[PDB]
């Protein structure tokens, strides 16, 4: 059984450096190339670099050259990847992966003429590294006014925008929980600044816009901020 | 130096799906060093196809690979509920390149179009010298959507922040996209639009600094 | 006094084309030892092998070493033509740290070390026809690994088999897995074999593993070229009689310098 056990999850601040380990087992460590590829939250895979555990030779990607360094420790069959000058755009899951091509058979003195890339047959479980410069900030709440134009019978959509908070989670209720039908609170988005933002919208009958009061109750326990904002039809 | 895949593919249980993977030259159309990988949410990839058409020991024969000219293809026959995952192709075109990733859905409910609600920036936010357009997308299946913003009729790419799709309680998907502007940009243009594309069909909503 | 009893201590470079071997034997220059790559496609009338010659590539041995050395020496040439052998499904250009060339792992320039591709080694059956007017000499090998672990990691089969045939001959070799004393820190070995193909004939090679494949053929010629072991320096003179102790004049009908002679020489007599 070939195994690639990676180090634990990392939470770093921008500008610092992170170093991830990858302990191999179940095969000759120095006989195969070892790749490092990352995957940003919600994006695809991006190959970073590979290393020859036999000789120590490396091959970094032009985008990562100058900022990432690969190394190995043959005694414990562990490889390391260090990223310097971390960005918020460096937040991803980092994987070490073993290459498919066998390149050395030591006792018979064989070395493959050239390396050909056929794939990565064994991957590590992945190391999650979060790079955030944000501290503990309460949210800003703005009203999302319902549409002034209304149909006879139809519905309106009003909500409140919970802007720039850290960290998760935040709870949103409408009229102190008395309004649950039609409530749709969307999962938050993580901005480049490291802060979160979400929106919560409730659909209500248009006839009720001018009589019923609608208030969204925002609660952010990490900062102990509570906001009761009233959402009313636009001025015109 | 890139490989292109369809963003989304879908099929019903028992059918067959094909995921293409196109390049340029000196890769998928010279060397067949093409490998395919299956990835479950929160899990490490698994090699399912190497050398273009070869299958590692233990991968079901329902998976198969075939080339053409500069395209590669992964076919999944006898589609099952457990086949739902993201599929990536990879090869070598000067360096190790990966495809964008294809989300394959095994259709268990009728395809639904997304509902799009776009809110203009509130008068409260504009007085804080900030402006955010909120584009809320819900009730679409399968859960793959591309969002494009427009200033009048010109594309906007800066200031956009879009979530990955999330599951609702009805087992359909929801997503949101935010466009950040200055109050001047909002008041200088005649209108802004949020364009939502799902399974080839586009839904568009428009807001302006003038309408009420 | 009609017996030639002395020589000049030097081999004259005329009128016969002399090819000094320096640190290389004829077989090492034939295979393509990195130190002997200067001898590629060279011709000679007399190849001079020195006692200081040594191998510096992968440790090998030649069953019937004398006959291959004699056959190539009596051809007087190392002209080599590359042929497009189609080994589909395997890894080529195998190298070794015991065969250094330009400070990098390398191998015999005339041989092609074939191994498995992703732990698969399909049965190679390749056919190479000789549509020429001369005879082709093919040099190939069989690799003998140390263990069964290396046997599998090199060829993905517990045992290979090699069969090189024509419409006239057949050569079938089984590798011998086992340890041997470490030559340049290598306990494996390679056995060298050769095959001659005539005009109109076809070279047939079947291998399931362990094949050290050829990259082409050597042209075979007929003539009075030969090989001689001597540590005598090569000099700027002219003499039609060469002995390992140097060139001798052919005035006398007899000579006692040495029995091994090349060219129009006097007969040998014992004495001293
Ligand atoms: C090496 O393998 C080849 C291909 O399998 C053999 O060629 C075949 O030989 C058989 C009889 O031995 C014929 O019936 C086939 O027609 C041949 N195939 C072709 C078209 O090449 C070859 O005989 C094998 N060599 C040896 C000596 O075993
Ligand atoms: C024959 C061969 O491939 N030799 C290579 C050479 O091309 C390369 O410049 C060097 C890098 O140090 O590694 C060795
Ligand atoms: C492999 O061998 C081929 C043909 O002899 C040659 O063209 C190529 O340079 C070799 N590759 C290496 C770097 O070994
Ligand atoms: C075959 O290739 C080798 C490369 O070392 C060269 O020495 C030889 O002359 C070539 N022969 C022909 C006919 O090109």
Shape of chain C: elongated
CATH level-four homologous superfamily name of the largest domain in chain B: Immunoglobulins
Q: In percent terms, what proportion of residues of chain C is strand?
A: 35-45%
Return the structural class of chain C.
mainly beta
- The multimeric state of the shown protein is heterotrimer
CATH architecture of the largest domain in chain B: Sandwich
CATH architecture of the largest domain in chain C: Alpha-Beta Complex
CATH topology category name of the largest domain in chain B: Immunoglobulin-like
Main sheet attributes: strand count, strand direction, barrel closure of chain C: 7 strands, mixed
- The total domain count of chain C is 2
Radius of gyration of chain C: 21 Å
> Helix tally of chain B?
2
Describe this structure as you would to a colleague.
The complex is a heterotrimer of chains A (236), B (212) and C (272). Chain A is mainly β. Chain A has two domains: 1-133, no CATH class; 134-236, Immunoglobulin-like. Chain A is built from no helices and 21 strands. In chain A, strands 2, 4, 5, 6, 9, 12 and 13 form a seven-stranded mixed sheet that branches. In chain A, β5 and β6 (58-60) form a beta hairpin. The N and C termini of chain A lie far apart (70 Å). Chain B has two domains: 1-108, Immunoglobulin-like, CATH 2.60.40.10; 109-212, Immunoglobulin-like, CATH 2.60.40. Chain B has helices at 123-127, 183-188; strands at 8-11, 17-22, 35-39, 46-49, 63-67, 71-76, 85-92, 96-98, 102-106, 115-119, 131-140, 146-151, 154-156, 160-162, 166-167, 173-181, 192-198, 201-207. In chain B, strands 1, 3, 4, 7, 8 and 9 form a six-stranded mixed sheet that branches. Chain C starts with a strand and ends with a strand. Chain C has helices spanning 26-31, 65-73, 148-155; strands at 3-4, 11-12, 18-20, 46-49, 60-61, 80-82, 90-91, 96-101, 104-106, 111-113, 115-116, 124-129, 135-144, 162-165, 170-173, 189-197, 202-207, 211-214, 216-220, 226-229, 234-235, 241-243, 246-247, 254-255, 262-263, 267-268. Helix content of chain C is 8%, strand content 36%. In chain C, strands 5, 6, 10, 13, 16, 18 and 19 form a seven-stranded mixed sheet that branches. Chain C has a four-stranded antiparallel sheet with strand order 12-17-14-15, with no helix packed on it. Chains A and B meet through β5, β9, β12, β14 and β15 of A and β7, β8, α1, β11 and β16 of B. A molecule of 2 linked components (NAG-NAG) binds next to β14 of chain C. The site of one 2-acetamido-2-deoxy-beta-D-glucopyranose (NAG) has 3 residues of chain C, from loops. The PDB classes it as viral protein/immune system. The entry lists the keywords Fab influenza neutralizing antibody, VIRAL PROTEIN-IMMUNE SYSTEM complex. The assembly is trimeric. A/Texas/50/2012(H3N2) Influenza hemagglutinin in complex with K03.12 Fab.
């Amino acid at each position: 059984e070939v195994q690639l056990v990676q180090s634990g999850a990392e939470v770093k601040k921008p500008g610092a450096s992170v170093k991830v380990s990858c302990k191999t087992s179940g095969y000759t460590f120095t006989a195969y190339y070892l790749h490092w590829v990352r995957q940003a939250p919600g994006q695809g895979f991006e190959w970073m670099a590979w290393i020859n555990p036999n000789t120590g030779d490396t091959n970094y990607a032009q985008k990562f050259q100058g900022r990432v360094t690969l190394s190995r420790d043959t005694s414990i069959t562990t490889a390391y990847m260090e990223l310097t000058r971390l960005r918020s755009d460096d937040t991803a899951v980092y994987y070490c992966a073993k290459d498919l091509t066998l390149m050395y058979v030591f006792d018979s003195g064989w070395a493959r003429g050239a390396h050909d890339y056929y794939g990565m047959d064994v991957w590590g479980q992945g190391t999650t590294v979060a790079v955030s410069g944000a501290s503990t900030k309460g949210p800003s709440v703005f009203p999302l006014a319902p549409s002034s134009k209304s149909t006879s019978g139809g519905t309106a959509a009003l909500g409140c925008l919970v802007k720039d908070y850290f960290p998760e989670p935040v709870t949103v209720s409408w009229n102190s929980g008395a309004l649950t039908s039609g409530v749709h609170t969307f999962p938050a988005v993580l901005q480049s600044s490291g802060l979160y933002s979400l929106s919560s919208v409730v659909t209500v009958p248009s006839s009720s816009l001018g009589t019923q009061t609608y208030i969204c109750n925002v609660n952010h326990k990490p900062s102990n901020t509570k906001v009761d904002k009233r959402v009313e039809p636009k001025s015109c | 130096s890139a490989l292109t895949q369809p963003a989304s593919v879908s099929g019903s249980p028992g059918q067959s799906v094909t995921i293409s993977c196109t390049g340029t030259n000196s890769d998928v159309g010279t060397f067949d060093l093409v490998s395919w990988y299956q990835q479950y949410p929160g899990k490490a990839p698994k090699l399912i196809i190497y050398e273009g058409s070869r299958r590692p020991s233990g991968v079901s024969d329902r998976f198969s690979g075939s080339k053409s000219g500069n395209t590669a293809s992964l076919t999944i026959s006898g589609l099952q509920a457990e086949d739902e995952a993201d599929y990536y192709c990879s090869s070598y075109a000067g360096s190790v390149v990966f495809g964008g990733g294809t989300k394959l859905t095994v259709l268990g409910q009728p395809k639904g179009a997304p509902s799009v609600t776009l809110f203009p920036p509130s008068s409260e936010e504009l007085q804080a010298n900030k402006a955010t357009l909120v584009c809320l997308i819900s009730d679409f299946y399968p859960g793959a959507v591309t969002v494009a913003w427009k200033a009048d009729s010109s594309p906007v790419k800066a200031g956009v922040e879009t979530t990955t799709p999330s599951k609702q309680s009805n087992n359909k998907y929801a997503a949101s996209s935010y466009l950040s502007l200055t109050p001047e940009q909002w008041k200088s243009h005649r209108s802004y639009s949020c364009q939502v594309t799902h399974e080839g069909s586009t839904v568009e909503k428009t807001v302006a600094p003038t309408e009420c | 006094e009609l017996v030639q009893n002395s020589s000049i201590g030097e081999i004259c470079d005329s009128p016969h084309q002399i090819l000094d071997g320096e640190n290389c034997t004829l077989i090492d220059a034939l295979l393509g030892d990195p130190q002997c790559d200067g001898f590629q496609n060279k011709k000679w009338d007399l190849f001079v092998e020195r006692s200081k010659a040594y191998s510096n590539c992968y440790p090998y041995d030649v069953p019937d070493y004398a006959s291959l050395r004699s056959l190539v020496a009596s051809s007087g040439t190392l002209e080599f033509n590359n042929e497009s052998f189609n080994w589909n499904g395997v890894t080529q250009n195998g190298t070794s740290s015991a065969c250094i060339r330009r400070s990098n792992n390398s191998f015999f320039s005339r041989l092609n070390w074939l191994t498995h591709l992703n732990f698969k080694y399909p049965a190679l059956n390749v056919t190479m026809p000789n549509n020429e007017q001369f005879d082709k000499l093919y040099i190939w090998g069989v690799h003998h690994p140390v263990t069964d672990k290396d046997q599998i990691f090199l060829y993905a089969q517990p045992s290979g088999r090699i069969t090189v045939s024509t419409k006239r001959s057949q050569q079938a070799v089984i590798p011998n897995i086992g340890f041997r004393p470490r030559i340049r820190n290598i306990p494996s070995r390679i056995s060298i074999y050769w095959t001659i193909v005539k005009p109109g004939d076809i070279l047939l090679i079947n291998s399931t593993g362990n094949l050290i494949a050829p990259r082409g053929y050597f042209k075979i010629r007929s003539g009075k070229s030969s090989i001689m072991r001597s540590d005598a320096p090569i000099g700027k003179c002219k003499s039609e009689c060469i002995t390992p102790n140097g060139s001798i004049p052919n005035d006398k009908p007899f000579q006692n310098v040495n029995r091994i002679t090349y060219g129009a020489c006097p007969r040998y007599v014992k004495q001293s």
